[PDB]
Homo-oligomer: A and B are copies of this chain.
Amino acid sequence: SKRHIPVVTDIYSVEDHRLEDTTHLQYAPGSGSGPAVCKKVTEHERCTTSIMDKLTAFFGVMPRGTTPRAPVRFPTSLLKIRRGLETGWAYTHQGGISSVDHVTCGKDLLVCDTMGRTRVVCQSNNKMTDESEYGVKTDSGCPEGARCYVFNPEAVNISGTKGAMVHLQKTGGEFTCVTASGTPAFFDLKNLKGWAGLPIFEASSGRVVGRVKVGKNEDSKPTKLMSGATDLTEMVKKITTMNRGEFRQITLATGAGKTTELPRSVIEEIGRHKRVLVLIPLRAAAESVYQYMRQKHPSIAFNLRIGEMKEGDMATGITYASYGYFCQMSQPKLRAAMVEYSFIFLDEYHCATPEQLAIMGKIHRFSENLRVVAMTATPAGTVTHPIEEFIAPEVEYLDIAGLKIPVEEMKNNMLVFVPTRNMAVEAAKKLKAKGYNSGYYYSGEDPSNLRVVTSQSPYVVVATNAIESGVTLPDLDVVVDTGLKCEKRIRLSPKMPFIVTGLKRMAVTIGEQAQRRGRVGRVKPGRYYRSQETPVGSKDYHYDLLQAQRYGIEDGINITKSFREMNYDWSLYEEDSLMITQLEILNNLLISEELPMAVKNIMARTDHPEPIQLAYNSYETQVPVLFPKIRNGEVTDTYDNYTFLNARKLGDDVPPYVYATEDEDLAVELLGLDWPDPGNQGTVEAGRALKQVVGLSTAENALL
């Protein structure tokens, strides 16, 4: 059925005919007459396609003996086309004849006229736009909102005569069906079959502005005639039609302006005085987008919330805020502030910051009152100039972070990704001892100390996978990837201490390796030296979730439970069901009794890296304990003296910790000591619950 030759059966010559009222001419579906430069049929010629010609054209073969024909050797007319069993139209214009692709299939028109057996050659065809050109396209543009119409010389109007027109109105890239008065009209699309290919004329000018291609009907919308960046407009439509209690996940390229232009479009669509919130992890990131946006769009108000909480904030523009900003609020205050925003955008959720998981769970508790849109350039479980890919061997040449690299590339700009900061500094000074322009970068460093090193023709910077951003490399040539990183991980066991948190060196993510290779090739081609380390798939957020539990202590909220329910509705993060269950039991223990005031103040004032430790352990021990530091796998006589703890050294008496670190567990093991067992109903029940959860016994009773 894709073989059929289109055959012109009727030719309707037409002339411009201005009428101030077209009511009697409209096609059967508040104020206005519908004045237009109508089309009047002056002649109706029937083509004389013979029986065999018709059947041959039906079976895809052009009848033998048809001569070509110029698309100008026609009267200004509308041509009825019958392709196999289907019906459509084409029309004449200065450039020739033009029709629709799904009507003609880009095939030559069979025209058996008074000029004989002829065929019009198809010069252009476009299936995406559904246009077919037998000549050069001459359709002129149309101003937005102008009234148009499409004329069918074979339809029956309200008056019951031959020749009916459907009035239109140009909106966006499509046309809207309206009556002669201008009321939005509805048409059953079956009542419009056989109209494709007809031209759309502007009412005032009587000039072609488009073709009849596709009909579309929405539930509450009137009938439309479609004509087939632009994706962002659809995104904004979907966002703005949201009802309170709905949630959308959006995947946007960073350059497409997920943080910048998307909220701007939304707020311009719903109203400049409506309140829209945009949550960003890093304070500096929120500040940057705030300055950039308020200087770029001076017509739209903006607000930045990264410092003290502004009580009773009702700021009208777009509010760029940090998650941690709202972590300063009690649960009822958080809800009262969140429901006042027309829309809430959760930015860069793929990052698992504790403030982020806490705020996401906490607001999901009242998600029924919110319109929530989560944005990322890279969702959960998503990897992301030409480039040479090298695989460097482990250890003419030189040694860079344990990899064999040829000395030639030391003439070029090199970025070496190394797991730890001690390794970063070590390799840095080892490289400067050999006579190279080396530097180092890790968490907490100033992006300016590197200015001295990067402002030179040859430089070699050794940095952690941490802070890929701040270093801003100029004209970077080669990257050396050790394939390793250093992240915090947690272990959960039914034996107290139930929680053990520590740094671990581990393989890099596949997508994160792609990010390390992403650095070179932006302005100039480059090369990569990669280890034989194989990447591992996914991100672990468990340590960050554990830390996020803190923001629920004052409100008595189980942040782990809130996260589980949130992720159930929103599907934003990969889940380890077992680990989430255990963490939820432990979090239940964490809020089981009011935190002592002394522990509260110590937690608020200390430079301890994981003050939640004090909270978990406070169910067994009131006195924090300083374990001896572990240097090179043995026990030392040094201690991490943190502020406000009023601690004691370990000695030979191991405290009954609920929460410990890998170095504390190691100190206990090396000292030949043992961890105490649970000492109250809370910790005993928590331990037996964790043990029951890790039940290897599976049993099932399924009706096959």
Q: Which residues of A contact B (CB under 8 A)?
A: 102, 130, 189-190, 192-196, 212-220, 225-226, 241-246, 332, 365-369, 556-558, 561, 565, 568, 585, 587-589, 591-592, 677-678, 681-682, 684-689, 691, 697-704
Contact = CB atoms under 8 A, between A and B. Distances in A.
A215 B702 contact: yes
A702 B214 contact: yes
Given A243-B689, A591-B245, A701-B226, A556 B219 contact: no
Nearest to A682: B243
A557 B587 CA distance: 25
A593 to B, nearest CB: 8
A302 to B, nearest CB: 26
Nearest to A677: B220
Nearest to A220: B684
A102 B702 CA distance: 11
Contacts of A685: 241-243, 246
Interface centre among A225, A684, A691 (most CB of B within 10 A): A684
A621 to B, nearest CB: 17
A703 B702 CA distance: 45
A215 B701 CA distance: 6
Contact of A699 (B217, B225, B241, B568): B217
A244 B594 CA distance: 12
Given A217-B698, A246-B588, A332-B332, 16 more contacts: A189-B700, A214-B701, A214-B704, A216-B700, A219-B698, A241-B681, A241-B688, A243-B588, A243-B589, A243-B689, A244-B588, A244-B592, A245-B558, A245-B589, A246-B685, A568-B568
Interface centre among A225, A242, A585, A701 (most CB of B within 10 A): A701
Given A215-B704, A677-B220, A244 B591 contact: yes
Contact of A588 (B195, B214, B368, B688): B368
Nearest to A193: B704
B701 A216 contact: yes
A688 B592 contact: no
Contacts of A212: 704
B368 A558 contact: yes
Contacts of A102: 703
Given A102-B703, A219-B687, A704-B213, A591 B368 contact: yes
14 contacts: A102-B703, A189-B702, A193-B702, A212-B704, A217-B698, A219-B688, A219-B698, A226-B701, A241-B685, A243-B592, A243-B689, A246-B588, A366-B556, A368-B561
Contact of A704 (B189, B241, B246, B587): B189
A368 B214 contact: no
A332 B366 CA distance: 14
Contact of A686 (B195, B243, B591, B681): B243
Contact of A245 (B588, B687, B688): B588
A245 B212 CA distance: 45
A678 to B, nearest CB: 6
B243 A699 contact: no
B558 A214 contact: no
A591 B369 contact: yes
A452 to B, nearest CB: 52
Contacts of A585: 245
A561 B566 CA distance: 12
Contacts of A687: 219
A166 to B, nearest CB: 11
Nearest to A679: B220
A689 B246 contact: yes
A686 B585 CA distance: 37
A130 B556 CA distance: 49
Nearest to A335: B556
A703 B368 contact: no
A365 B557 CA distance: 10
A105 to B, nearest CB: 12
Which residue, A243, A369, A588, A678, has most C-beta atoms of chain B within 10 A? A243
A594 to B, nearest CB: 11
Contacts of A216: 699-701
Contacts of A691: 219
Name the residue among A194, A219, A689 with the largest chain B CB count within 10 angstroms.
A219
Shortest beta-carbon contacts, A-B, top 4: A245-B588, A368-B558, A189-B702, A196-B704
Nearest to A593: B244
A159 B60 CA distance: 46
A214 B557 contact: no
Contacts of A367: 561
A28 B243 CA distance: 52
Contacts of A192: 702, 704
Contacts of A242: 685
A691 B220 CA distance: 13
A109 to B, nearest CB: 19
Nearest to A102: B703
Nearest to A702: B189
A217 B591 contact: no
Among A189, A561, A591, A700, the one with the most B-chain Cβ atoms within 10 Å of its Cβ is A700
Contacts of A130: 703
Contacts of A196: 703-704
A71 B243 CA distance: 55
Contacts of A589: 243, 245
Contacts of A587: 368
